[PDB]
Design an enzyme around this catalytic site. Structure first.
Site, PDB file in Angstrom:
ATOM      1  N   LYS A   1       5.728  15.124  -7.657  1.00  0.00           N
ATOM      2  CA  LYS A   1       5.452  13.698  -7.684  1.00  0.00           C
ATOM      3  C   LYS A   1       6.518  12.953  -8.484  1.00  0.00           C
ATOM      4  CE  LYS A   1       2.619  12.634 -11.798  1.00  0.00           C
ATOM      5  NZ  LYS A   1       3.550  11.562 -12.271  1.00  0.00           N
TER       6      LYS A   1
ATOM      7  N   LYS B   1       3.103  20.746 -17.678  1.00  0.00           N
ATOM      8  CA  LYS B   1       4.001  20.172 -18.674  1.00  0.00           C
ATOM      9  C   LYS B   1       4.363  21.137 -19.792  1.00  0.00           C
ATOM     10  CE  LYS B   1       3.569  15.356 -17.901  1.00  0.00           C
ATOM     11  NZ  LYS B   1       3.002  14.008 -18.217  1.00  0.00           N
TER      12      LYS B   1
ATOM     13  N   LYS C   1       7.808   9.021 -14.316  1.00  0.00           N
ATOM     14  CA  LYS C   1       8.717   8.160 -15.059  1.00  0.00           C
ATOM     15  C   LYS C   1       9.397   8.873 -16.220  1.00  0.00           C
ATOM     16  CE  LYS C   1       5.361   5.370 -17.112  1.00  0.00           C
ATOM     17  NZ  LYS C   1       4.441   6.290 -17.853  1.00  0.00           N
TER      18      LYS C   1
HETATM   19  N1  LIG Z   1       3.865   9.589  -8.132  1.00  0.00           N
HETATM   20  C1  LIG Z   1       2.767   8.858  -8.691  1.00  0.00           C
HETATM   21  N2  LIG Z   1       2.244   8.296  -7.601  1.00  0.00           N
HETATM   22  C2  LIG Z   1       1.142   7.484  -7.721  1.00  0.00           C
HETATM   23  N3  LIG Z   1       0.572   7.253  -8.942  1.00  0.00           N
HETATM   24  C3  LIG Z   1       1.115   7.820 -10.053  1.00  0.00           C
HETATM   25  C4  LIG Z   1       2.192   8.615  -9.923  1.00  0.00           C
HETATM   26  N4  LIG Z   1       2.556   9.070 -11.131  1.00  0.00           N
HETATM   27  C5  LIG Z   1       1.712   8.567 -12.043  1.00  0.00           C
HETATM   28  N5  LIG Z   1       0.832   7.825 -11.378  1.00  0.00           N
HETATM   29  C6  LIG Z   1      -0.258   7.024 -11.736  1.00  0.00           C
HETATM   30  O1  LIG Z   1       0.235   6.107 -12.555  1.00  0.00           O
HETATM   31  C7  LIG Z   1      -0.757   5.898 -13.679  1.00  0.00           C
HETATM   32  C8  LIG Z   1      -0.104   5.949 -14.925  1.00  0.00           C
HETATM   33  O2  LIG Z   1       0.285   7.324 -15.222  1.00  0.00           O
HETATM   34  P1  LIG Z   1       1.565   7.695 -16.305  1.00  0.00           P
HETATM   35  O3  LIG Z   1       1.625   6.629 -17.408  1.00  0.00           O
HETATM   36  O4  LIG Z   1       1.339   9.101 -16.831  1.00  0.00           O
HETATM   37  O5  LIG Z   1       2.927   7.659 -15.377  1.00  0.00           O
HETATM   38  P2  LIG Z   1       3.929   8.940 -15.144  1.00  0.00           P
HETATM   39  O6  LIG Z   1       4.934   8.540 -14.112  1.00  0.00           O
HETATM   40  O7  LIG Z   1       3.160  10.176 -14.713  1.00  0.00           O
HETATM   41  O8  LIG Z   1       4.669   9.204 -16.568  1.00  0.00           O
HETATM   42  P3  LIG Z   1       4.819  10.666 -17.286  1.00  0.00           P
HETATM   43  O9  LIG Z   1       5.863  11.506 -16.501  1.00  0.00           O
HETATM   44  O10 LIG Z   1       5.297  10.414 -18.705  1.00  0.00           O
HETATM   45  O11 LIG Z   1       3.469  11.352 -17.332  1.00  0.00           O
HETATM   46  C9  LIG Z   1      -1.834   7.067 -13.468  1.00  0.00           C
HETATM   47  O12 LIG Z   1      -3.047   6.430 -12.848  1.00  0.00           O
HETATM   48  C10 LIG Z   1      -1.258   7.904 -12.701  1.00  0.00           C
HETATM   49  O13 LIG Z   1      -2.152   8.714 -11.835  1.00  0.00           O
HETATM   50 MG   LIG Z   2       1.685  11.025 -16.009  1.00  0.00          MG
END
Ligand SMILES: Nc1ncnc2c1ncn2[C@@H]1O[C@H](COP(=O)(O)OP(=O)(O)OP(=O)(O)O)[C@@H](O)[C@H]1O
Ligand SMILES: [Mg+2]
Ligand SMILES: Nc1ncnc2c1ncn2[C@@H]1O[C@H](COP(=O)(O)OP(=O)(O)OP(=O)(O)O)[C@@H](O)[C@H]1O
Ligand SMILES: C[C@H]1c2c[nH]c3cccc(c23)S[C@H]1C(=O)O
Ligand SMILES: C[C@H]1c2c[nH]c3cccc(c23)S[C@H]1C(=O)O
Ligand SMILES: [K+]
Ligand SMILES: [K+]
Ligand SMILES: [K+]
Ligand SMILES: [K+]
Ligand SMILES: [K+]
Ligand SMILES: [K+]
Ligand SMILES: [Mg+2]
Lengths: 326, 326
Positions: free
Chosen positions: A192, A111, A195
């Site tokens: 991956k 990041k 969001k």
């Molecule tokens: N592609 C993904 N696939 C499965 N689980 C995910 C994935 N991305 C995030 N997570 C899971 O979702 C949960 C919440 O993570 P988080 O709030 O950081 O979402 P994010 O999509 O990674 O948002 P950001 O990009 O802001 O980090 C964590 O347990 C994390 O491992």
């Molecule tokens: Mg994340």
């Protein structure tokens, strides 16, 4: 009964990746464990969030937690910043972790790479996450694959505290699902689904409408071989779509491979879009119910009172072990 | 009436350096300003503190604040960790400062150099210090010379917050005394006297007895020229001792130079020791009174209630500006 803790950042609207990798399993685990589920708004601001969007993403995530079936009488649902103990224990754990350990974290490296100036909060993301977990004597942390390293650091920090000061923390353990632990981006299948991706085509959010989901799936990048079969190295896009299809419909991957013999990518993607749409349909309806009501705030109020009682007591023990205060 | 904030770490017993550069001026400033004076135990643990020693150093520093004449009805005296808002605002300011700014701090570079592993808290020392200052709409920060850079970063963080989110913080300004802003170590006159020096001969604490002060001054390192005259570049040890002598006795440097014409270092150092001893005598007597009594805790209790009211309100405004919580 063992204790579960997990959090999600209000950095955006949660995706099907967040749902498949984490939130979906929260809904079963609430009946088997003492569960804390957190909206980690102090983690979200480690990168820039527009204040109006962040306030609203916090409400939306609370609504989505409850919309997908988290029962506020079986689990504690609360906002991180409404429990001061998290910031307090995060400072103490910042004095335990070494800088070298934070700099070798994969997420920090990813990041921050290519950025000219990033915040100290991005670097110190793990101690705050370790605080969230450790304050509640957590046994199990359900997360996706990308958080395994953070949980490993949390275990190290807990052991270090326990051996430098005396036994206080439970050593937590990650629970990573065998399927769907890492949904890939729709536009770049080698990273991956996230969001916070600057490209909205990369992810499906839980609030996307039907026409949006159709567009995003039909423009998901794939190879040109034209054969619907699972192969991560050679067909990473189609493999990812088969994973999403499989885990949301309950059909195995080989069942789907048989179902689409002699079929083109076009009918596969059209079908998958409707599988996702039908999946999100009841969720979005309960979501709109919670957004229109003051009951959402009462749940979060009660959650923060319960979390404060537990956490602020563990902070007292942490301070007494380190010699802070009186 | 403008507001003053300043803190001192319970990382040890305060020295004559801390007294001359800071604490002594607190005692006059309490009558002219709204004053907050803080025991910053969360800063102290950015390096290792033994828990039993830290608990006791916290009580001793509180006793020394009051022993040197800080009136708890004219100033607010409190312990940092008993006001959760400090850790809360420190997290928010950690998301404002950039890593590059923390790494170029002189104190971080000095205190981490040569160490194989230092804590993240050492790096993030300034945002917590900026939080301490900014929560109380501070105008003036009385400190020694070595903190000028930290105050400059605090001004930057406040401006940045104000311009990224809207006007909220007062821009503080350092007040550095013209004399005694940097007392030097007795055993190495090219570095400042520090209460955490591994070598106790480097500093005089406010609790040193007479025989200890005599030993430490007579072994203070000097040149071999044998002439008592002020010259920072060529006679840094004698210059430092003349500074301590001058500022504690009220005699000017040139008056002392005249007073010791044709006199040797031996009679100069013997005399200085008694000047310091007589200076510390009434302080140590009021110190022992406060340590033997429960009134010390009531002062700190009241101080924390007053500080919490102000600080936890500024935290509410900070959260609303950034969009955290609800
Ligand atoms: N592609 C993904 N696939 C499965 N689980 C995910 C994935 N991305 C995030 N997570 C899971 O979702 C949960 C919440 O993570 P988080 O709030 O950081 O979402 P994010 O999509 O990674 O948002 P950001 O990009 O802001 O980090 C964590 O347990 C994390 O491992
Ligand atoms: Mg994340
Ligand atoms: N040699 C010194 N001379 C004058 N003022 C000093 C000196 N050292 C510290 N100070 C001042 O004393 C105040 C308290 O600082 P602090 O609690 O860090 O003391 P310290 O001696 O530097 O302890 P440490 O070695 O743990 O940092 C600050 O305003 C600081 O600038
Ligand atoms: C949501 C983030 C975080 C906040 N505190 C916790 C506690 C448990 C699991 C996680 C988290 S998962 C982590 C992530 O970045 O994925
Ligand atoms: C005592 C430390 C610190 C704690 N928060 C504050 C607030 C004002 C001045 C200072 C401090 S001075 C600083 C130092 O390291 O000298
Ligand atoms: K965002
Ligand atoms: K979007
Ligand atoms: K794949
Ligand atoms: K110490
Ligand atoms: K000592
Ligand atoms: K000098
Ligand atoms: Mg210092």
């Amino acid at each position: 009964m063992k204790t579960i803790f997990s959090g999600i950042q209000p950095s955006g609207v949660i995706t099907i990746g967040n749902y498949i990798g984490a939130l979906r399993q929260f809904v079963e685990l609430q009946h088997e464990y003492n569960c804390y589920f957190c909206i980690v708004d102090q983690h979200a601001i480690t990168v820039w969030q527009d204040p109006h969007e962040l306030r609203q993403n916090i409400r939306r995530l609370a609504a989505l937690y409850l919309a997908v079936g988290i029962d506020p009488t079986q689990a504690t649902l609360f906002i991180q910043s409404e429990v001061p103990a998290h910031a307090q224990a995060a400072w103490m754990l910042q004095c335990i972790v070494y800088i070298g350990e934070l700099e070798r974290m994969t997420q920090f490296k990813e990041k921050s790479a290519g950025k000219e100036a990033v915040s100290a909060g991005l670097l110190t993301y793990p101690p705050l996450m370790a605080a969230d977990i450790l304050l509640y004597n957590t046994d199990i942390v359900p997360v996706g694959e990308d958080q395994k390293q953070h949980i490993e650091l949390t275990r190290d920090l807990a052991e270090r505290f326990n051996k430098r000061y005396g036994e206080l923390f439970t050593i937590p353990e990650a629970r990573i699902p065998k399927v769907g632990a890492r949904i890939m981006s729709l536009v770049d299948p080698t990273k991956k689904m996230s969001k916070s991706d600057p490209n909205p085509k990369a992810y499906i959010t839980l609030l996307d409408d039907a026409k949006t989901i159709e567009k995003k799936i039909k423009s998901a990048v794939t190879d040109s071989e034209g054969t619907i079969r699972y192969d991560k190295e050679a067909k990473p896009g189609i493999s990812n779509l088969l994973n999403i299809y499989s885990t949301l419909s309950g059909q195995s991957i080989e069942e789907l491979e048989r179902q689409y013999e002699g079929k083109g990518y076009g009918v596969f993607k059209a079908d998958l879009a409707q599988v996702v749409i039908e999946t999100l349909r009841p969720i979005q309806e309960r979501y709109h119910h919670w957004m229109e009501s003051e009951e959402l705030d009462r749940v979060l109020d009660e959650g923060a009172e319960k979390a404060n009682r537990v956490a602020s007591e563990m902070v007292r023990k942490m301070e007494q072990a380190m010699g802070l205060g009186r």
